């Protein structure tokens with residue numbers, strides 16, 4: 001009931017992903033409706049959104065959200081491409097669009113493109129009541145200084161959520177990137193409008209418990225509700241969570 005309590009609460013914070021074909025999206029939606037309850041969302045490729053929305057409706061769980069990704073996984077610095085992709089994500093049906101920050105451009109000293117890209121995508125999401133999450137790719141940024149700066153620029157440009165990772169490079173979330181990023185939320189005073197999402201690095205019920213207690217110590221135990229905290233993860237975190245719940 002410390003581990004059982006936080007396992008329940010983490011499972012309900014999950015953004016469940018594959019690991020995409022039509023038959024796998026389907027099984028995913030089924031995977032997300034568990035016997036102790038539902039993850040908050042699934043996370044899939046935009047093309048698969050209509051089919052997932054249906055599967056989720058048919059199975060009694062319309063309230064499970066559908067999150068998706070754009071400029072992904074590379075985080076190139078073409079704004080037009082990142083924006084048109086975002087516009088289509090929205091048109092497909094997405095509740096949230098996770099856009100990859102142009103982190104290579106920041107590493108080469110250009111902060112402005114990150115700012116304008118995030119902001120271009122936010123205006124379109126906002127217009128459509130879709131959340132805009134920003135993946136900064138901590139495992140490629142690597143330096144605390146760059147993790148901090150990507151995070152701030154994303155927030156200055158209107159990110160509703162900041163996310164460690166794509167899940168497509170070697171290093172996802174670490175306790176340290178996650179802390180650095182949440183510290184930026186705290187340091188800008190934006191806890192009310194910006195949530196956080198580790199991707200990678202949470203594999204066990206005990207991991208999730210650790211990551212949530214970092215948010216709880218920084219902001220109090222009430223902060224990490226589903227709007228402000230998600231575990232971007234896959235079937236195996238979910239099975240560990242469920243294992244610790246019996």
Ligand SMILES: O=[N+]([O-])c1ccc2[nH]nnc2c1
Pocket residue numbers: 015017043067068096097098099131132133134161163165166197199230231232233
């Ligand atoms: O922007 N997102 O709401 C969001 C949610 C779950 C994710 N998993 N991986 N990336 C993700 C982005």
